[PDB]
């Protein structure tokens, strides 16, 4: 229907609402299905754009250009190309995990395209640094990459429960383990490296669009102080809400708690 963007990113547009356009962008290891519980709440007031990030399970690996995605800039360029194709004057953008940062980077280039950013499970840097707590030391990354490269399937089964949190036998843990294992293992290792070694802290002052910073109180990959870091270093107005949820994909695993929070941040503007 919409062409290369639709074929390459499985782009879907639903809803017939007139308050505006909402773009939903998923994190590493999942796909647009991560939004399944949010979309029904948005279609009455909004037009909702869903897409899969290049290299996600449902995408064709033949379109994955390793040089393009060597930095997160390539993902931000993909997002700008989607927004331009869509002929959006502006949108509410909800970015999960790495897509939070991808949106923020895109918004530096084209602040006109974004009325606000909702940053769910966001971090500007996973590695600790001097006076900065991201939750990870380089040794932890080396152990992670070693598992990923030794037996990716076993890694997926062992990682899913830690990342999703809550009960191990839950539908959500099984679902994420499956979407993780849909990533071709060479793409998975490459992208994980790119993400886990990225550091966009010095870019945050350039972000001028209002940002709503939403995360789980207990999230393996995002210590709560990271929300505070974002709040103190973004270049525009921001607000933080730490949810009484566990896990890095809480819109999938605890929607009864999380969907109301996301809807409030979508609907209510900060001064």
Residue numbers in the entry: 0 to 270
Passage from the reporting paper:
Rice, a significant crop and representative of grasses, relies on KAI2-mediated Arbuscular mycorrhiza (AM) symbioses to flourish in traditionally arid and nutrient-poor environments. This study presents the first crystal structure of an active rice (Oryza sativa, Os) KAI2 hydrolase receptor. As observed in previously determined KAI2 crystal structures, OsKAI2 comprises of a canonical α/β-hydrolase fold with the binding pocket situated within the central core domain, beneath the helical lid domain (residues Tyr125-Ser197). Upon a closer inspection of the binding pocket, the conserved Ser-His-Asp catalytic triad is positioned at the base of the active site. The pocket comprises a hydrophobic cleft made up of phenylalanine, isoleucine, and valine residues, making it well-suited to bind the aromatic rings of KAR or KL-type ligands. The OsKAI2 pocket was compared against that of AtKAI2 (48) which shows similar pocket residues, with the exceptions of C162 and A191 in OsKAI2, which represent smaller side-chain groups in the positions of A161 and G191 in AtKAI2. The OsKAI2 pocket analyses revealed a pocket measured to have a volume of 108 Å. This is an intermediate pocket size when compared to others in the family, such as AtKAI2 with an approximate volume of 63 Å, OsD14 at 149 Å, and ShHTL7 (51) at 215 Å. Strikingly, due to its distinct proximity to the ligand binding pocket, residue C162 was selected for further inspection. Interestingly, grass KAI2s contain a cysteine at this site, resulting in a receptor that is sensitive to both (−)-GR24 and dYLG ligands. Therefore, the C162 found in grasses may be important for selectively sensing grass-related KLs or grass-related KL AM signals in the soil.
